[PDB]
Design a protein around this ligand. Structure first.
Ligand SMILES: O=C(O)c1ccnc(C(=O)O)c1
Ligand SMILES: [Zn+2]
Length: 224
């Protein structure tokens, strides 16, 4: 399919978005409603994800988290706003999106000319720090710069699932915005938190990994 939505553990689902360069995002089906982690590539891909969500649950999509300011994590925002979902980010992500959206769209279109010239759509729920959703069962945090300056991790304590965002993945991927020397320092700050992790969902390539995906990418970026 163009996109799939598949259970990984309990209420935690993985989105494989095969549009453009495959990106993986996540969905949490909560008691009051649905949290989407990563807005997907475009308003069209977001609409496709919503269609999948509505075959699983009748509960509203409450919020969508932009885990960085890039097109693969925020491109769907217009759609999510349009259906009354909150668009959630850190202040840093929001600020970088305001200043740099035009540039990331342009950059995206250099490699993907077919990608739409999307107007800026900012988060309307902005956090100054780390934050949680779903009664503490979705936990967003910053552990330093890596693939971009602002990228956050999302952790699901009950299921011991870590969303890797653009940060953790199988291949090196794109380093144009990366802080290559800080990247492993950020991964070591993450590892030092000693979070119980059974599963890491890579934001690109094949999603399903164990905690060793952290070590995998760390070794790669240290050779870059
Ligand atoms: O290869 C790309 O165009 C691409 C697009 C979005 N994200 C990444 C990444 O490495 O995170 C790479
Ligand atoms: Zn990415």
């Amino acid at each position: 399919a163009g996109m799939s939505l598949t259970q990984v553990s309990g209420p935690v689902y993985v989105v494989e978005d095969n549009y453009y360069v495959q990106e993986n995002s996540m969905v949490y089906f909560g008691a009051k409603g649905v949290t989407v982690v990563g807005a997907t590539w475009t308003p069209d891909t977001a609409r496709e994800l919503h269609k999948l969500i509505k075959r699983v649950s009748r509960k509203p999509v409450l919020e969508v988290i932009n885990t960085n300011y890039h097109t693969d994590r925020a491109g769907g925002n217009a759609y999510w706003k349009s259906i009354g979902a909150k668009v959630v980010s850190t202040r840093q992500t929001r600020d970088l999106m305001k200043s740099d959206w035009a540039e990331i769209v342009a950059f995206t279109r250099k490699g993907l000319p077919e990608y739409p010239d999307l107007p800026l759509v900012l988060p309307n729920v902005v956090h100054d720090g780390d934050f949680t959703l779903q009664e503490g069962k979705v936990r967003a945090f910053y552990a330093g710069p890596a693939h971009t300056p602002d990228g956050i991790f999302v952790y699901f304590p009950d299921e011991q699932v870590l969303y890797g965002n653009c940060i953790l993945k199988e291949k090196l991927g794109n380093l144009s915005f990366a802080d290559v020397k800080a990247y492993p320092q950020t991964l070591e700050r993450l590892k030092a938190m000693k979070l119980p992790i059974k599963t890491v969902i890579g934001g690109h390539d094949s999603p399903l990994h164990g905690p060793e995906l952290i070590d995998h990418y760390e070794a790669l970026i240290k050779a870059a």
